[PDB]
Design an enzyme around this catalytic site. Structure first.
Site, short mmCIF file in Angstrom:
data_model
loop_
_atom_site.label_atom_id
_atom_site.label_comp_id
_atom_site.label_asym_id
_atom_site.label_seq_id
_atom_site.Cartn_x
_atom_site.Cartn_y
_atom_site.Cartn_z
N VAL A 19 7.89 1.40 -7.25
CA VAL A 19 8.86 0.69 -6.43
C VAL A 19 8.28 -0.51 -5.68
CG1 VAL A 19 9.62 1.45 -4.09
CG2 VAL A 19 11.18 1.54 -6.04
N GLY A 20 9.07 -1.59 -5.68
CA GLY A 20 8.69 -2.88 -5.10
C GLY A 20 7.57 -3.44 -5.95
N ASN A 21 6.49 -3.85 -5.31
CA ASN A 21 5.30 -4.29 -6.03
C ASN A 21 4.40 -3.06 -5.83
OD1 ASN A 21 2.82 -5.57 -6.90
ND2 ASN A 21 3.18 -7.45 -5.72
N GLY A 22 3.52 -3.12 -4.86
CA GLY A 22 2.65 -2.01 -4.49
C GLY A 22 2.62 -2.00 -2.99
N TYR A 24 4.39 -0.36 -0.77
CA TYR A 24 4.44 1.00 -0.23
C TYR A 24 3.34 1.94 -0.78
CZ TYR A 24 9.02 -1.14 0.56
OH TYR A 24 10.01 -2.02 0.91
N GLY A 25 2.56 1.44 -1.73
CA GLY A 25 1.48 2.20 -2.34
C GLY A 25 2.00 2.91 -3.57
N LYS A 42 7.16 9.64 -3.24
CA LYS A 42 5.87 9.24 -2.68
C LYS A 42 4.83 10.23 -3.16
CE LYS A 42 3.50 8.00 1.66
NZ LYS A 42 3.36 8.40 3.09
N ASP A 141 5.76 1.49 12.71
CA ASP A 141 5.72 0.42 11.72
C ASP A 141 7.10 -0.21 11.39
OD1 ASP A 141 3.45 -0.04 8.79
OD2 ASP A 141 4.84 -1.46 9.78
C1 LIG Z 1 7.64 7.28 3.15
S1 LIG Z 1 7.05 5.64 2.61
O1 LIG Z 1 6.01 5.79 1.66
O2 LIG Z 1 6.89 4.77 3.72
C2 LIG Z 1 8.40 4.95 1.66
C3 LIG Z 1 8.83 3.65 1.90
C4 LIG Z 1 9.89 3.12 1.18
C5 LIG Z 1 10.57 3.91 0.25
C6 LIG Z 1 11.74 3.36 -0.51
C7 LIG Z 1 11.65 2.10 -1.14
C8 LIG Z 1 12.76 1.61 -1.86
C9 LIG Z 1 12.71 0.28 -2.53
C10 LIG Z 1 12.08 -0.81 -1.90
C11 LIG Z 1 12.09 -2.05 -2.49
C12 LIG Z 1 12.70 -2.24 -3.74
O3 LIG Z 1 12.68 -3.45 -4.33
C13 LIG Z 1 13.35 -1.17 -4.37
C14 LIG Z 1 13.39 0.07 -3.75
C15 LIG Z 1 13.95 2.37 -1.87
N1 LIG Z 1 14.02 3.53 -1.24
C16 LIG Z 1 12.99 4.06 -0.58
N2 LIG Z 1 13.17 5.26 0.09
C17 LIG Z 1 10.12 5.21 0.00
C18 LIG Z 1 9.02 5.71 0.68
#
Ligand SMILES: CS(=O)(=O)c1ccc(-c2cc(-c3ccc(O)cc3)cnc2N)cc1
Length: 285
Positions: A19-22, A24-25, A42, A141
């Site tokens: 998800v996204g780029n990296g 969120y890891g 995650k 954050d």
């Molecule tokens: C708990 S964490 O690791 O901080 C975390 C942080 C974020 C998400 C998350 C990211 C996305 C997402 C983001 C960008 C994008 O382009 C497409 C999708 C959608 N839903 C989510 N829940 C999930 C766990």
């Protein structure tokens, strides 16, 4: 309330793509095998020592993530490995498919948002924060990246509070240690500063010292006067809100409850129309 009940994610969840780029890891766009339903997964490597620090991470998401402005917790899974380590832990949550607020600014022409949009999202950020704060929780954050939209235009938060120091741009002055602030303590009010910076991010396309090397920005946040909106185009209620959010000394900075009564947030007649406006931008996938 134990890691033993945690099933192998095998015929339950599939990992589609990161998800996204990296950003969120190791956060993946997951699929619920049976329903085809989407979830955000995650992934993390877990040792015999990490077992008790993780039991709380799950309980945090279990308790606190059951509010509309917080991405819902679904469940937890362990992907076991041989006796020579290391087990994977999957934290399944709501997949907010419309991406993040960062995506919104980047995808919007000229990388600025309509003021009524900032008002809407900022109210929802505050409404989510109010929930964490009333439960004695500091998000720690708040930033565009950590504020997500559903395909239903619902604003939802992620990443509430291991070896690294991340990005300084949204950090409240009090969380950065210097000579008069040696033991630098996070307050509920730190999330309000970060929220204010997120609103500048939404307004100008990036946070106040984006052009600085992260170390230089870290140094400047506690010394520089509060950041201000560059343009004069903004309404009185907007500069006022940014001001309220960005009180340099946390001791006079307002509560999340006080901010929710600020005219910028309180007074929102276009609320319904804005939600429709955001939904249509989402529809343009
Ligand atoms: C708990 S964490 O690791 O901080 C975390 C942080 C974020 C998400 C998350 C990211 C996305 C997402 C983001 C960008 C994008 O382009 C497409 C999708 C959608 N839903 C989510 N829940 C999930 C766990």
């Amino acid at each position: 309330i134990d890691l033993s009940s945690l099933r192998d994610p095998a015929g339950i969840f599939e990992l589609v793509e990161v998800v996204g780029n990296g950003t969120y890891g190791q956060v993946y766009k997951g699929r619920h095998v049976k329903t085809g339903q989407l979830a955000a997964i995650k992934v993390m490597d877990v040792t015999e020592d990490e077992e008790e620090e993780i039991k709380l991470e799950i309980n945090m998401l279990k308790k606190y993530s059951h509010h509309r402005n917080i991405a819902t917790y679904y469940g937890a899974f362990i992907k076991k490995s041989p006796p020579g380590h290391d087990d994977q832990l999957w934290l399944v949550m709501e997949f907010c498919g419309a991406g993040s607020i960062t995506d919104l600014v980047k995808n919007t022409k000229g990388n600025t948002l309509k003021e009524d949009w900032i008002a809407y999202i900022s109210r929802e950020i505050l409404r989510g924060l109010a929930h964490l704060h009333i439960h004695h929780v500091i998000h720690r954050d708040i930033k565009g990246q950590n504020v997500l939209l559903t395909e239903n235009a619902e604003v939802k938060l992620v990443d509430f509070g291991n070896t690294f120091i991340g990005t300084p741009y949204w950090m409240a002055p009090e969380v950065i240690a210097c000579d008069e602030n040696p033991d630098a303590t996070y307050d509920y009010r730190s999330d309000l500063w970060s929220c204010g910076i997120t609103a500048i991010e939404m307004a100008e396309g990036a946070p106040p010292l984006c052009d600085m090397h992260p170390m230089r920005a870290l140094f400047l946040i506690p010394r520089n006067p509060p950041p201000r909106l560059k343009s004069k185009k903004w309404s009185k209620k907007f500069f006022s809100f940014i001001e309220g959010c960005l009180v340099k000394n946390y001791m006079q900075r307002p509560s999340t409850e006080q901010l929710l009564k600020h005219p910028f947030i309180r007074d929102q007649p276009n609320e319904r129309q804005v939600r429709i406006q955001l939904k249509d931008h989402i529809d343009r996938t």
